[PDB]
A paper describes a structure:
Receptor binding and immune escape have been recognized as two major drivers for the evolution of receptor-binding domain (RBD) of the viral spike (S) protein, which is responsible for receptor recognition. Receptor binding is a key step for SARS-CoV-2 infection. In this study, we evaluated the binding properties of BF.7, BQ.1, BQ.1.1, XBB and XBB.1.5 RBDs to human ACE2 (hACE2) and determined the cryo-EM structures of hACE2 in complex with BF.7, BQ.1, BQ.1.1, XBB and XBB.1.5 RBDs, respectively. As previously reported, the binding interface of SARS-CoV-2 RBD in complex with ACE2 was divided into two patches.
XBB is a recombinant between BM.1.1.1 and BJ.1 sub-variants, and XBB.1.5 is a descendant of XBB, which has more substitutions, including G252V and S486P in S. Notably, compared to the XBB S (KD = 123.7 ± 6.18 nM), the XBB.1.5 S (KD = 25.97 ± 0.94 nM) has an increased receptor binding affinity to hACE2. Compared with XBB RBD, XBB.1.5 RBD only possesses an S486P substitution, but the binding affinity of XBB.1.5 RBD to hACE2 is ~2.7 folds higher than that of XBB RBD. Q493 of RBD binds to K31 of hACE2 in the four out of five complexes except for XBB RBD/hACE2 complex, in which it was S490 of RBD but not Q493 binding to hACE2 K31. In addition, RBD N487 also forms an H-bond with hACE2 Y83 in the BQ.1.1 RBD/hACE2, XBB RBD/hACE2 and XBB.1.5 RBD/hACE2 complex structures. In the BQ.1.1 RBD/hACE2, XBB RBD/hACE2 and XBB.1.5 RBD/hACE2 complexes, RBD N477 contacts to hACE2 S19 with an H-bond. In the XBB RBD/hACE2 and XBB.1.5 RBD/hACE2 complex structures, hACE2 H34 forms an additional H-bond with RBD S494. On the contrary, the side chain of S486 points in the opposite direction. P486 interacts with M82 through VDW. However, the hydrophilic amino acid S486 cannot interact with any residues in the hACE2.
Residue numbers in the entry:
A (entry chain B): 333 to 527
B (entry chain A): 19 to 614
Write the structure that this text describes.
Amino acid sequence: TNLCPFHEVFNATTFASVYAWNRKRISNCVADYSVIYNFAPFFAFKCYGVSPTKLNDLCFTNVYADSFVIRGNEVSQIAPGQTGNIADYNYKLPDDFTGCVIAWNSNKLDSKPSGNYNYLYRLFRKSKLKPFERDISTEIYQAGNKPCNGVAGSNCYSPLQSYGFRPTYGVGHQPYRVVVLSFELLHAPATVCGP
Amino acid sequence: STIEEQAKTFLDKFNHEAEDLFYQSSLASWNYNTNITEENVQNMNNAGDKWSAFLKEQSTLAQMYPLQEIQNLTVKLQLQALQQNGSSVLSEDKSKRLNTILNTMSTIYSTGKVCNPDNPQECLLLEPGLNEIMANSLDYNERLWAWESWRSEVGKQLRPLYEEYVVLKNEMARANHYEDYGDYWRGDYEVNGVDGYDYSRGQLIEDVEHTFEEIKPLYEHLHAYVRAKLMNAYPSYISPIGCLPAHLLGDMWGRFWTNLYSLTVPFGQKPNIDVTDAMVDQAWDAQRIFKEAEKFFVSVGLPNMTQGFWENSMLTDPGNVQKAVCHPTAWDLGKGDFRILMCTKVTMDDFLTAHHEMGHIQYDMAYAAQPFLLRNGANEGFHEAVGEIMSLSAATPKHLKSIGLLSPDFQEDNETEINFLLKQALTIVGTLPFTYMLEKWRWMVFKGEIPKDQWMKKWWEMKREIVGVVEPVPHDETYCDPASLFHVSNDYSFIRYYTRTLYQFQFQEALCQAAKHEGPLHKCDISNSTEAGQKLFNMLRLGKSEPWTLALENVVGAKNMNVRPLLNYFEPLFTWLKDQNKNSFVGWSTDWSPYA
Ligand SMILES: *[C@@H]1O[C@H](CO[C@@H]2O[C@@H](C)[C@@H](O)[C@@H](O)[C@@H]2O)[C@@H](O[C@@H]2O[C@H](CO)[C@@H](O)[C@H](O)[C@H]2NC(C)=O)[C@H](O)[C@H]1NC(C)=O
Ligand SMILES: *[C@@H]1O[C@H](CO)[C@@H](O)[C@H](O)[C@H]1NC(C)=O
Ligand SMILES: *[C@@H]1O[C@H](CO)[C@@H](O)[C@H](O)[C@H]1NC(C)=O
Ligand SMILES: *[C@@H]1O[C@H](CO)[C@@H](O)[C@H](O)[C@H]1NC(C)=O
Ligand SMILES: *[C@H]1O[C@H](CO)[C@@H](O)[C@H](O)[C@H]1NC(C)=O
Ligand SMILES: *[C@H]1O[C@H](CO)[C@@H](O)[C@H](O)[C@H]1NC(C)=O
Ligand SMILES: *[C@H]1O[C@H](CO)[C@@H](O)[C@H](O)[C@H]1NC(C)=O
Ligand SMILES: [Zn+2]
């Protein structure tokens, strides 16, 4: 094994916002999901498409890593067949998804008494989100029928809004660091897997 | 974009820019209630000013998606909450004057000072002093002195400024498109749009007057019994044919009759379940008290309390190191934060107050999934009804015997159970006629049915017809007696208590029937009953999303309010009262003045 940075993804000083959604290609060594079962209790371990232990024993052509932090009550929206603010207007999961979802509380790291307004998520979109697709853009979104010329105001709104995490929030509003893993197959020969 | 897809959005931005600003104001208020310092006041002022500015800006921006074109009873209640020109329909030179009127009234009421017709040193204020002199005194002249002195110094200096409040508030009521300011206050009982559940604004006027009829027979017997028991306390002061002076009721304004228990105790020489001694004996503390309560609410099927309540909620007085306002209060800061602030002591009263505030947090937790504007009680009389049904459930001897506070024999003889009914009635039965009288007087001293020159000639005529009190000395027109009360001097609705009282017993009877309880209703404990908890929750969850008619029907099955549940709670006491009133006189003559 070459030890892919499965400890640089699930181990970083700062993640990105809900709407950015970084992506490393990993797929460079033997899977080591033993450490995944470690590193504190998890609020949800909901692999769809395989089984935990069953893993560490399957050849995957490419395993994309994806990282972001959301609030507690919105963790359940990262799943196929789910409609919600994050699902409809941020990252989307296909109805035929096959992977794992890993989430754990991060109140001590990503919260401030004054408020953490460095994590942004989109609220309004003039259309829906296709599967595995990003969209970064500040273009103002028009509610009414009078175009705006990119100026805030009457029936005119700026999309991405700030979270404002505080340590005294409830379990549903505390930051929850979520990493979702991807599993797809390609015509290329499988090499990134254990013996 | 129907004005239903330009209002769906507006409210999505409001729900996110309101939560943060409400949380920051709530946190500032909590910090000030923890430390009473100089910086905390500034933080409170800044947070409140920002919150008020945001509310005003959103209210001004709102009115723009007209009312008549929305069709989603929910997106329309939120608009009702936001679209609302309270005191912003007035000219800039009138709102400031009105605010000055309210500030002056509050300052005059708070800084009360009677002083004595003698030594010009002692200047007893309201709390303490006058409230103490009306609570634990048996003299007659002294109580009359206090009663007349409070309404002489304070009363005179409050009418010239009430007469000007009854003009500007009415004129504002005509502007925001309402009939009158009383009609303004009877607005949260108004539901329109849904078929079969409507409730007109004037319908409450008839409903209250129809429900107080099926009470007169019980309150009349209670008044006769109280008068008969008060004969011996004040021999040559009360006549059997008619009313009781208003300065001999243990309360300053007659709102409650609680302090008359020591004078009107029924079968005495038989104490009431007081487990305070067992508290010291068995080493009970505040944490264990609150643990015991989480256990009651987990029995009826309702949920546990987050660790945040355990970690961030003060439960004991810190001491002299800090300065905190010792007042039981349930805090809903929002965003999953729930706290209770109270200075707990090892007593049964604090044990019941803990259940009361804990019921407040369970209601608040129930509707946490609703939008921001609908996160409240169905009306102004549901949030305090399930804070008090649980106190009744916990106070039952059966519940106390199941947790280890009484020796497990405690023969539940009928001799002492009736002392609990009369004491419990002196705070419920004795306040409804007072509330009805005060609210009716305020309602018609606005519709113009009582011209100014008659303001205080009708009042003392209503208190001799509706209730059984009479003024000790004549009052001319220049007095203003109702303004002496805390609620009249400020701007608070007062009819909510009558509705609270008549709703709590409906809820109690419905839950007890759902719990397969057999016997009298006052012996009902709702613990270990999942069905009752489920039935309450299906009402606690909706909040303001649906009319209060449907919310009430979901639990009691009745379309509107009723007084039968409350007269069924008092049947043994009522029968005993009839039994001991055969030789006495029931009723009063509206013509016995304790001054000729
Ligand atoms: C509420 O119920 C608990 C638990 O009792 C169990 O559940 C009941 C529905 C019933 O099926 C009982 O037979 C079960 O044992 C009660 O707690 C017990 O109370 C009894 C009283 O005799 C006592 O002997 C046990 O030690 C208690 N068990 C504990 C404390 O774990 C509780 O008293 C009930 N509340 C009431 C009656 O108000
Ligand atoms: C009211 O609006 C909400 C939010 O758009 C919608 O979910 C709901 O179905 C509407 N009510 C009905 C049943 O028409
Ligand atoms: C509720 O609280 C009690 C006491 O704190 C605890 O023993 C119990 O496990 C809790 N139950 C749930 C379901 O949270
Ligand atoms: C209580 O019960 C006894 C026994 O029947 C009865 O004689 C009495 O009248 C009842 N009332 C009281 C409280 O004395
Ligand atoms: C990375 O940081 C986390 C968080 O402190 C720690 O638990 C983990 O052991 C570290 N491992 C590395 C260096 O990848
Ligand atoms: C006041 O008391 C609170 C609660 O203990 C504490 O957190 C805060 O720092 C104190 N503030 C002052 C004014 O010292
Ligand atoms: C009050 O606000 C403005 C004041 O001119 C008015 O146009 C609006 O209709 C009023 N709002 C109400 C009564 O809903
Ligand atoms: Zn309360």
